[PDB]
Design a protein around this ligand. Sequence first.
Ligand SMILES: [Fe+3]
Length: 817
Amino acid sequence: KIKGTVVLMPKNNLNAFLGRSVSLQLISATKADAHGKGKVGKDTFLEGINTSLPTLGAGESAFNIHFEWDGSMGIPGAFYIKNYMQVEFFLKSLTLEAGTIRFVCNSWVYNTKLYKSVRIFFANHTYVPSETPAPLVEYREEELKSLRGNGTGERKEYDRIYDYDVYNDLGNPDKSEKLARPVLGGSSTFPYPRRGRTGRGPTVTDPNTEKQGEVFYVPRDENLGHLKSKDALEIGTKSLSQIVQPAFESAFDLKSTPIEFHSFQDVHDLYEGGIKLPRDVISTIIPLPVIKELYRTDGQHILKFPQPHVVQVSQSAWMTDEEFAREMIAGVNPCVIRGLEEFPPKSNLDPAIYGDQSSKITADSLDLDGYTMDEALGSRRLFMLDYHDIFMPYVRQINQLNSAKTYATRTILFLREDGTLKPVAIELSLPHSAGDLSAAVSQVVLPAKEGVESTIWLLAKAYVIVNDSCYHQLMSHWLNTHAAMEPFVIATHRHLSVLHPIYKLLTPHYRNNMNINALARQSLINANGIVETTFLPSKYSVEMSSAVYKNWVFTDQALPADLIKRGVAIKDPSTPHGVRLLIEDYPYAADGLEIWAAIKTWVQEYVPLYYARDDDVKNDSELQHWWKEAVEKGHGDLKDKPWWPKLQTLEDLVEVCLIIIWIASALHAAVNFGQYPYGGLIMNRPTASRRLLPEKGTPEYEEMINNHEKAYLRTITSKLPTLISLSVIEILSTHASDEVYLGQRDNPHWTSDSKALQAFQKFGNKLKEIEEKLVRRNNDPSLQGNRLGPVQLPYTLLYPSSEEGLTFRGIPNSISI
Ligand SMILES: [Fe+3]
């Protein structure tokens, strides 16, 4: 007999797993039947509870099992398992002793009757397809066929079927015509990454829109369970939209709290004394998992939000021009600023539609610390935050909404000799066309510290940051991380076996991504969901991200390519990373290059363990099918584009894996974990603007003079949507205590290959080394202006490690929140 140990986690006593409850059958990797498929042994049941091993913990139990297995039956390489119990359990592992064979499973096993085919698990060996032991080749391909399913049917909780569909599940046209939304994906008008297929079928009123459902399916093992309810952060979004948001709304409908903030102190009060709300509103929040962690409460009437990092040292520093500019390089959205190499800035928009698009900013009006414009341009000291061409096509329709008004903005920045950025002009642009009923005009606003001009300049920064917050949430964050990554998740499970080296390399970087995305489609980006009800563009929000996706380029997601494309660095082979930054102390980019380099080294060391030559990549059938599908189906609306890597070389494989890991880990961390730390003060990161600048001689103009804080608050996001936005960004900025960070894996035995395990240890050591280096940077007094700023907030977003909570640091493996 072969002595084995099964470790599993009950859904939630242990004796019910005994008798005839659970059977396993070992499968040979070396002895085949007459069809060349590995021989399968007898059904073998769990025989007793193992009590010996202390190294267990975390709700796990271990079971003893002995398999009949003459050396005749060869060496086991897989096993089947059948659960005869009513309730599913979570299978962790099988270990066969005496040399040892390890099976890492980490999968829910439902009752046997629910599966078309018996659950199969492979030993922890790694094989490209041409290396699969012959008796497992068919089992390997059949499991992939199982995972792909057939493209039809309503997916159920226990299904493990990965497939693609368009974003046609956001609208709710059966409820109201007002909730109808365009399908995103699958047309030239609205290209978009695909998402995981759910198959709920058509609405009554629109055969192109998928009907509503209480649960948005993900393949079962994508739906992460948590030992602690407080760690199920993704379910908070659902509770917030479905339960908490209506509770807040009723407090305002009943006039139990003032409808608007009246001064900046009313906002600061949220994390000081708190806000007083009706008892039944407090009573709605307090017992909810995740939500109850968002606020401190007296259990009666008070909710208090946590103090955001951006105000922890100075509550007024956000208002400084130094901090406004610094956050474009070290803030929540540090990846949009561009070099400006000519002046005035140009527009590619059609003047026949929007009016003359010539910039109104004059060079002679700008304070460039004594530099002439030619000098600033030539010394590469001029930059911009350019939302003009992005927003202008949407300004007319946005401004037609009740309580939304925006400009398409452009901000010019000058890189001072001291290495900090300063803002020197903001252009607030509006489209103009012959029939317009509005008399509002485009304006240029310059910095000012006193008088009504200082208030107009503060408002101008707010309009800019409304554009930036919208672009950050929809494009930098949602489109470029969450949405862009999902097609790669699906392709990987459809086409790379669990045995495949590139499966093992990439899948840690997918943890929880399909799950959070599905919950997002249900409650965050749905019609009348959180984003539409809290951000400027309202019902146009998600379609705006489709327009931006038209210009998404996979190879420009690589950090060096991004920096070069935006004109914030230049190619320079004489530097360690091959690029020279044009803003030397650009914290996101300088820290990012270190992480990028570490990932690249890891990928370059792993790949050659499995692919010796370009030919070995061309000839890997799973890899070729994977990449073909990811591009032609997953990102199929951009399959016509010339820039996709072809995947016929070692270099191409490294490039593709490096970009995927980068997007999933560091890029997402840098744009996600700063949300509450910077945006928890709504004045610092307004999500919406509700009026344009006022005309002279109006009461709104006199208000700017007499009550500037009220002028500002009437312009930005109202109090009710503020309470909702703050709550959701608090959730999304939190690290669950069971997170798995870059340099970590959930199991030490993910492969039996010692060289791959060594390479991975080297990678984790390098990240520790990098963190020491980043610590030294933050402690360097010369770098204070950009790494800390007047808010005195050290840039820690790209520190690789973190404890649980709202920590402003730590790089998870994946897009996990
Ligand atoms: Fe995120």
